[PDB]
Amino acid sequence: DWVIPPIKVSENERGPFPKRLVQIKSNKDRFNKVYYSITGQGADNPPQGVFRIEWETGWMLVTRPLDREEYDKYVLSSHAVSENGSPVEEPMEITINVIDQNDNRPKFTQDVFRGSVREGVQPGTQVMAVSATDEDDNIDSLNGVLSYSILKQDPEEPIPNLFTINRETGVISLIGTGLDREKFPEYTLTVQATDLEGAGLSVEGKAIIQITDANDNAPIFDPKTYTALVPENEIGFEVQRLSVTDLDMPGTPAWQAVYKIRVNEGGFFNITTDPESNQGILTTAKGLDFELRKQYVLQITVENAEPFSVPLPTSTATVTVTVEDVNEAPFFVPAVSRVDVSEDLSRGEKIISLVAQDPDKQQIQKLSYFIGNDPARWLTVNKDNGIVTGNGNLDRESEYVKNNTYTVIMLVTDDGVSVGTGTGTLILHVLDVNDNGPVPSPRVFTMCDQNPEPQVLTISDADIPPNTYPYKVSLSHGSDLTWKAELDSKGTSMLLSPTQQLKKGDYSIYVLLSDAQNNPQLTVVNATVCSCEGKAIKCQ
Amino acid sequence: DWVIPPIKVSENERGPFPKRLVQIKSNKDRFNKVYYSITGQGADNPPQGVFRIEWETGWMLVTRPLDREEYDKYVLSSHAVSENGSPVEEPMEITINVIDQNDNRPKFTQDVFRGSVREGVQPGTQVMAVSATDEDDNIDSLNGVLSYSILKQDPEEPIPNLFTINRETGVISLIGTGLDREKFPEYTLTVQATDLEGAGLSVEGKAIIQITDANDNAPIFDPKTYTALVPENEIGFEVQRLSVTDLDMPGTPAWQAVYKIRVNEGGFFNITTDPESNQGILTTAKGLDFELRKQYVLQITVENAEPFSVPLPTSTATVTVTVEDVNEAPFFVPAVSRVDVSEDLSRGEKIISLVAQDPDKQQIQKLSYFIGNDPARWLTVNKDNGIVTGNGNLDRESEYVKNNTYTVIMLVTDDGVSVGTGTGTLILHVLDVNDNGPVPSPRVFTMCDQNPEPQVLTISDADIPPNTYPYKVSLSHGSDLTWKAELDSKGTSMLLSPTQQLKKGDYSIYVLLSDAQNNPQLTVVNATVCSCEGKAIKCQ
């Protein structure tokens, strides 16, 4: 058909109501009276009564103002019946479009936006982002397009133009330079959005930016030069602690100190760090020792764990140390294999005039010499002059003496001012003299009767050679009660044989030898005889 | 709206009734049950029940056959109410048109049409006009248009195609030739009219034509030659009547005869016409007279009053007349101043031998002569010979005779066969003779005594001159008793005087005269005298 165009109507209209929109006519009215009515939402349906028609003229009206924001369009159905009561025309659809008007102010997405950036970054860096909206049209008008802006950053210091915002997108960026968490950490700037691309109505928001941290700062010592005293030897011990103040953020690696000495003399120092006021705690690496050095001039520089965000001054601490003195024990010089001395020494004679030395050249402390180790008592010391003399009777020949030795240990004490011990061994070579003289091996026989065979006997000397070289056998009172002497060819033994057919048991034979001579006297080597033929038998 | 088209329905429909026309639906039926009804003429209004609707389906039906001729259209109103009882749709107008069907035969305007035309007219002449009608449509179909025609003229003689009719208009015209009122005056022809321009149904009428009259005919005499007898003189009189027969229409000028003679001899004839059988009535114009003519051959032609509608033969009647004779009176020839005759005629002498003449030469009829007029008896006639003689004594001298005349009239009579008179005057010159003689004037005197003066006396003669010429006086016995005679110079008188002194009265004197002589004797002229002197005095 020839339909009927949609009807545009403005919003928030205002004048004298009613307002005729249009007029409709059924031509089938030649016959009876026609009754015009109309139906739909806004008509008889909810919102009832916005539009109504004059049953007799065919006029359509808007009865009151409208807000497209509420309902932006309506569709209606129109009718025409006869007085008799019958419909005449197939109904007719009707449309109305509600044209937008700038009745709406915009509104920010949130009531407050927050942001953060680091202090050391470069100009032209994107920080935050902000939103807002207008409910009016924005597809055929500007009643709903906004334009963003900024008008007041607080801390109007260092300067007041650190940022800008993209008018269309509302994004903010760092424009200037001079950000420092250490002086001004959080800005609060006021934003506004406007109707018709900055032309219409405006509103406010608030965005707040916190500033991350940077290693803008270096560490600073609170003393620059310290001093402490120290002892030579127990040690590995705490000398002095140090103080400092970095200014970036505390629990952070831009706040933790790292040290080191420049030069470690004997490399006898270690230094650690501590999460207190991360003071510098210095200590001794390997004890000290001395009388060698009293002075210690060393320097320690301090850094952070992480590198610096800028060239900065490295700052050292210069420190002086002094070693207190402890006084140590003295010592005999050697451990003496000294005196190759003979057995004939006169009880009270100079053996070893000895001396001991003591470390501490503070030496105005003497000591006393004491002896100590010990198989039995011979020797003697002058305690205030360390003089070892030889008292007593010695005898290389016999008991304690093991290999050609006699080892003895002695002491010495550090007095004068405190304490001390000195353990020193002393081996002294004893010597030989020909003391003893020759002696027979077996002392009792068992001779036989009829024809006894030679009674083997031998010789032994306690002395050391030559002193036991060859012999000379001799028979004293009974050199004839019949007894005849004899030597083995290979030196050592002697052959003892009677020369008479003598008696039934129990009787001695006086013996007498010599080796350089010395002559011993020996003696009786008794002789038990019991009935027989010729071989030395078990007796009775 | 989207209305609803008119519904065409045929007429005189026929099949199984009902017949669904259309179905209607209210869409507002989602809510309750809707009740369909319908109203109007043909519905609930007169013709009630032609159409009805099914309250529950919405079907509309035609219940029975229809005739557009009765009602050619219907308009209806449809309704729809809810069960609860409320109307839902404004009613709806409904229309039905009833399409025509050839159910109607045509019909003539009148039951019989009449007409008339004159016999002598020319082919291609409009006569009558005829009408008729069909009641079916004639504006979209041919169910109502007719075509006219003819199929039977009676008097299928002279020929049978004297006319035609205009098929579309129904007008009739003369097509042929030969119309004669005189033989066939009234035709009766049958006409027909037809459906669909001569295609559908047909009917009959009747038209009757009478034929006016024309002067097709001339007049015809019934005798062709007549005869009649006639008398000379009373006259102006009816000779003979004539018969004829024209054949056109009687009371009409195409039936009235007009005559005339060809040649009117002395122009003594008139002829009129008469509304009887309009015979020719001939008569005498001015008496006749004769003995001059006996024969009359004349001719009379006859026409009509109005000219002829065609060349025709003029027909004459030839007629013969004969004049009977009447015999008239005779006549003396003149009226005579004849006879200068003298007074001395001898009683019985020829004066006037006269004759008279009579007209009719049939003359074997004589007459008798009689006299008639009259102062006294002298003359005489021979009656059978007309001879006037003179008997008697005449005398020019005296009484009847006036101027020198004597007039007399006489007669004569026509006998022999019938009657007659003849009046003729007659003057006859009488003559003079000297009869008488002289005579004295006074006859008695009165003379005087002493001295009487002359007594005058005179003379007179009865005669005519010379006969009275001069005198001669004479005195007889007393020529002396004293008396002396005398004449006047101028002739006539005489002087009478005595010569004696004589006596006293009473006495005569004898006188005597003459004129040729004749001599009279006169006489006594007495004389009375009485006393005196000299003048003739009165006496005593």
Ligand SMILES: *[C@@H]1O[C@H](CO)[C@@H](O)[C@H](O)[C@H]1NC(C)=O
């Ligand atoms: C930003 O927020 C802080 C915290 O309240 C406030 O003290 C300061 O004034 C605001 N503006 C700037 C530029 O710091």
Ligand SMILES: *[C@@H]1O[C@H](CO)[C@@H](O)[C@H](O)[C@H]1NC(C)=O
């Ligand atoms: C020396 O060392 C001591 C240790 O107690 C310290 O207090 C002092 O500051 C250092 N410097 C000097 C000059 O004494």
Ligand SMILES: *[C@@H]1O[C@H](CO)[C@@H](O)[C@H](O)[C@H]1NC(C)=O
């Ligand atoms: C670190 O020590 C310096 C030296 O006096 C001082 O100026 C600074 O304020 C100290 N740091 C802090 C946080 O006080």
Ligand SMILES: *[C@@H]1O[C@H](CO)[C@@H](O)[C@H](O)[C@H]1NC(C)=O
């Ligand atoms: C202190 O500094 C030294 C030198 O680098 C390092 O080895 C040590 O681990 C530090 N102490 C601590 C607790 O970090």
Ligand SMILES: *[C@@H]1O[C@H](CO)[C@@H](O)[C@H](O)[C@H]1NC(C)=O
């Ligand atoms: C530390 O060493 C420096 C370098 O010679 C010296 O001046 C100072 O006296 C020493 N000790 C102290 C107490 O500073």
Ligand SMILES: *[C@@H]1O[C@H](CO)[C@@H](O)[C@H](O)[C@H]1NC(C)=O
């Ligand atoms: C000698 O030195 C040895 C080796 O230590 C030791 O066993 C002995 O007791 C010391 N004295 C003597 C008499 O041998």
Ligand SMILES: *[C@@H]1O[C@H](CO)[C@@H](O)[C@H](O)[C@H]1NC(C)=O
């Ligand atoms: C010296 O050392 C000895 C070891 O034999 C010890 O018993 C003694 O206590 C020490 N003397 C002193 C004075 O400290």
Ligand SMILES: *[C@@H]1O[C@H](CO)[C@@H](O)[C@H](O)[C@H]1NC(C)=O
């Ligand atoms: C020295 O004396 C000390 C103290 O008893 C002892 O421990 C040590 O064994 C002794 N000997 C030596 C050779 O120092």
Ligand SMILES: *[C@@H]1O[C@H](CO)[C@@H](O)[C@H](O)[C@H]1NC(C)=O
């Ligand atoms: C040997 O025997 C004798 C005889 O009785 C006796 O006197 C002596 O003591 C014994 N031994 C020695 C070595 O004299």
Ligand SMILES: *[C@@H]1O[C@H](CO)[C@@H](O)[C@H](O)[C@H]1NC(C)=O
């Ligand atoms: C016409 O009418 C006359 C009068 O009745 C009738 O006699 C005649 O037959 C009809 N037809 C004609 C052609 O004369």
Ligand SMILES: *[C@@H]1O[C@H](CO)[C@@H](O)[C@H](O)[C@H]1NC(C)=O
């Ligand atoms: C003569 O006249 C008479 C008159 O009576 C008439 O009857 C007759 O027809 C006429 N013709 C002849 C030849 O007689």
Ligand SMILES: *[C@@H]1O[C@H](CO)[C@@H](O)[C@H](O)[C@H]1NC(C)=O
């Ligand atoms: C007129 O006279 C003629 C002559 O005989 C005749 O033929 C005719 O019929 C007459 N007219 C009439 C109407 O009779």
Ligand SMILES: *[C@@H]1O[C@H](CO)[C@@H](O)[C@H](O)[C@H]1NC(C)=O
């Ligand atoms: C008869 O004919 C004569 C000749 O024309 C005419 O004068 C006369 O009037 C006619 N008579 C009648 C009655 O028409």
Ligand SMILES: *[C@@H]1O[C@H](CO)[C@@H](O)[C@H](O)[C@H]1NC(C)=O
């Ligand atoms: C009439 O006149 C004609 C013409 O001569 C003649 O023949 C006839 O006899 C006359 N009279 C009669 C009686 O016809």
Ligand SMILES: *[C@@H]1O[C@H](CO)[C@@H](O)[C@H](O)[C@H]1NC(C)=O
């Ligand atoms: C003569 O004629 C006259 C004239 O008519 C007449 O009067 C008279 O009577 C006649 N007779 C005589 C005698 O005169």
Ligand SMILES: *[C@@H]1O[C@H](CO)[C@@H](O)[C@H](O)[C@H]1NC(C)=O
């Ligand atoms: C002749 O005429 C006379 C006139 O005087 C008349 O009296 C008479 O009757 C007539 N005679 C005859 C015979 O008719």
